[PDB]
Each structure stands twice: as C-alpha cells, then as structure tokens.
Amino acid sequence: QPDGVQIDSVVPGSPASKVLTPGLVIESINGMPTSNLTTYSAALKTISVGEVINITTDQGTFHLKTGRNPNNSSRAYMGIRTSNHLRVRDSVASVLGDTLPFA
C-alpha cells in the first residue's frame, strides 16, 4: 500500500541537509504528487542536477535543490533516505523446504 513517501533520515552531501527535517512526509512535488514509490521515481527521472523542485509536506511547502550524487552517478540525487513507510503487519514467510540433490 503506497500512501506517500516519508523522509527517513538526512545525511550530509545533500542540499537538503539543512533545508528539511528527517521524519517528515512528502505529500507532493511540483505538479507531481508522490503517493507511491514509482511516482516518486517517475518525478525524479525528469529532474536534473542543480535543479530546484517544489515539495509540499505536512510541515509546509519547501523548495529543494537536487543533490550532487554521492557514490553513484545519476540525475537529481536527493541524498536523504526516503521510503513509503509500509504499514507494519505480519505477512509471515515461513520456510517451505530446500531440496538438496546428491551427485
């Protein structure tokens, strides 16, 4: 159930390091609402490095500059750990069994 993307944590190397707060929820980007993980990516794929986007959150609307791509080269690298924050439940994945062939 995608229901918005939330900010997990803010690490250095991003312009957002002193712009937003970790723990906040991203409601929508400029003309592009991010209720899902894919829509977040679909928006991100159009943004360039050094470009500034408009992000409305619970804590208000902020303007964010795309990061400078640490460790990896891509377009628009936010730099903050972000996730849709899946609703906690117990969908257990029990071990079925592993068949071991003997040669």
Q: Where in the chain are the domains?
A: 1-85
Experimental approach taken:
NMR
CA separation for the pair 51, 26 (Å, rounded): 18
Q: Which residues contact 9 (CB under 8 A, 6 or more apart)?
A: 22, 80, 81
> Is residue 10 within 8 Å of 24, Cβ to Cβ?
no
CA separation for the pair 39, 44 (Å, rounded): 8
CA separation for the pair 74, 42 (Å, rounded): 14
Q: Tell me the three state secondary structure of residue 45.
A: coil
CA separation for the pair 81, 88 (Å, rounded): 19
Cα 59 → chain centroid: 17
Q: How many CB atoms lie within 10 A of CB 41?
A: 11
CATH number among 2.60.120.1090, 3.90.1150.10, 2.30.42.10, 2.40.50.140, domain 1-85: 2.30.42.10
CA separation for the pair 43, 51 (Å, rounded): 13
Query: Under the phi-then-psi rule, with left for phi > 0, alpha for psi from -120 to 50, and beta for the rest, what region is 4?
Result: left
